[PDB]
Ligand binder design. Sequence first.
Ligand SMILES: [Fe+3]
Ligand SMILES: [Fe+3]
Ligand SMILES: [Fe+3]
Ligand SMILES: [Fe+3]
Ligand SMILES: [Hg+2]
Ligand SMILES: [Hg+2]
Ligand SMILES: [Hg+2]
Ligand SMILES: [Hg+2]
Ligand SMILES: [Hg+2]
Ligand SMILES: [Hg+2]
Ligand SMILES: [Hg+2]
Ligand SMILES: [Hg+2]
Ligand SMILES: [Hg+2]
Ligand SMILES: [Hg+2]
Ligand SMILES: [Hg+2]
Lengths: 340, 340
Amino acid sequence: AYTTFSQTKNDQLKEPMFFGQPVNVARYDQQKYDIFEKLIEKQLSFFWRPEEVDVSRDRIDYQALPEHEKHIFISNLKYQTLLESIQGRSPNVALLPLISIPELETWVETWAFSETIHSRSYTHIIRNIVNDPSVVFDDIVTNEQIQKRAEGISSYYDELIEMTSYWHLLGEGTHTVNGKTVTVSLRELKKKLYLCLMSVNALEAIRFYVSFACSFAFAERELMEGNAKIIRLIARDEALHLTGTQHMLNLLRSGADDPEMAEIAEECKQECYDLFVQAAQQEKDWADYLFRDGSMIGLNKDILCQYVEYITNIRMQAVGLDLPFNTRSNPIPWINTWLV
Amino acid sequence: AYTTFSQTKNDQLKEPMFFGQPVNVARYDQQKYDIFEKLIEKQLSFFWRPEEVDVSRDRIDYQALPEHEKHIFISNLKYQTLLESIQGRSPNVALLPLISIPELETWVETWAFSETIHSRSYTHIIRNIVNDPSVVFDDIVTNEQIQKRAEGISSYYDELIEMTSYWHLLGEGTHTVNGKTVTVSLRELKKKLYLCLMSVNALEAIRFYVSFACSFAFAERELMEGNAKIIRLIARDEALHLTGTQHMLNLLRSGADDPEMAEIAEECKQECYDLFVQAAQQEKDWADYLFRDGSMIGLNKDILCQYVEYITNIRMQAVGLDLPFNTRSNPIPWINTWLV
Ligand SMILES: [Fe+3]
Ligand SMILES: [Fe+3]
Ligand SMILES: [Fe+3]
Ligand SMILES: [Fe+3]
Ligand SMILES: [Hg+2]
Ligand SMILES: [Hg+2]
Ligand SMILES: [Hg+2]
Ligand SMILES: [Hg+2]
Ligand SMILES: [Hg+2]
Ligand SMILES: [Hg+2]
Ligand SMILES: [Hg+2]
Ligand SMILES: [Hg+2]
Ligand SMILES: [Hg+2]
Ligand SMILES: [Hg+2]
Ligand SMILES: [Hg+2]
């Protein structure tokens, strides 16, 4: 079972990242993995408040935009808001019960916290461009075109969360619950975790970035500049979050942290590959609904599609997966002005 | 049955604080209880970086302290560290899965995050006043005296978490798990949450404050100035935290939220009372250890006992409970200088 304070004095430097003894003392003078303490420090140094960003001229910019451009901007915004909503709570509820080293535990809480700030920034933006925010917020839950990735993303988390509860409550083995057999396997739980993480890595590394291009295209035209300044800050944060998930995944697949996970990851590589391509395909299909009424300056269905493949190749290679698309240089180098 | 993004489009203004539909969209343009949005805003405005606080003068001060005074200081510090370690993760793991309104969800995450900053501040303090932090950190886990004073905190959170898992997995009813009859009652789970909340309130409003007094006793002597600045910053945050729990509890008691919670608050009021009485006694019993090698001018077992009764009455009155201790004036008015 899970405990908020394991009474056993353990060497936190020897525990695996996940599934070891629950973290008792929160100390930051040492760590098994330096990267996580460095990320906490960086994230704290980047603290920012949405309210301190002037977005007063974004309202007029939005109203003056052609209808299809309003659609593009607002549709993209709703999706970003959806992703931040999930990322604000999910890392905590899903990972906290499985972490066994203090630096990773606090990094996850810090990572999640920074996501709630992003959520607050989107409320700030929405309240300053539509007059009646409720219209926007409600269409997030029910929007068909958006509620497909949410289902897929939330699914990975929910299944991991469910299996984690069974593991903590019953432990490994073949159990029975109300006439049904319930098998609890640590190997499968480990695979499930490797899956949220890969999926979360694609979310942080691909899904968010594709939306940033959608957003900075306006900035390039000196429009929605308040929104742009906020996205710049958010993007600076996401870079840290993806760095964190990339290290977690690489440490798990290399075999140094947990040999069993390395074994499991090698076994489900084809699955992770398809999982990544699937994510990229969903982002591509979205371009349709986004540019169904037309495209805009420096951005269209084809360009975005190219960008998705460009970014995906990079991210997948970073975690040891084969490249699914043809290699080529950045289709939209101008994006670098707003990112890194 | 828990989900990271419920697909049902619900009116978040009509959900109860707890046990309603899990929060889907994180919006901050409106709230059922604006007090939580105000608390998030205030906590964000108080953001501080522990490492920025100059504690270089603390090593000299500490080493020059009489041995019994070093024992008092460090023992107090180790307990505070324990409480922050627990408070950094528990709010998230125990409450997050049960919150049904966005403002409360984010407040809990913000509250927990601020506690991790406090934990980081203690590492900063420890690392700068002793040769080997590991001895201090390891003693926290062991040391029967410290765990004696904290006995009941981790255990309560753990019970709630386990019951919550059963609820999410099996739902309401009487079940058969591995041949054993397991009862899952929402009413009983609500009681567990309610009493956990009262326990955290006692933790936030009493346990932390009795420790601040010991810390500020050194500040009064012009010693441990760095630690003092940090404690003032921590105390400022704890004031928001206890304001948060007091409001949660009193809102539940009012009957304006979940009607059943109002019933429960009334039914278990003796439980609430007993919790404080027990916590106060634990804080008092800690005196024998704290002063085992001797006391200090203005800080001894008697004064500690008097302050515990003083503050406990204040906190209990704040949530509608009878006062167990004889009324008295502040036994250490010099603390005001350092608080609020
Ligand atoms: Fe974000
Ligand atoms: Fe992120
Ligand atoms: Fe704290
Ligand atoms: Fe607190
Ligand atoms: Hg996931
Ligand atoms: Hg795009
Ligand atoms: Hg995989
Ligand atoms: Hg994958
Ligand atoms: Hg594409
Ligand atoms: Hg393409
Ligand atoms: Hg509790
Ligand atoms: Hg004290
Ligand atoms: Hg009760
Ligand atoms: Hg009560
Ligand atoms: Hg007393």
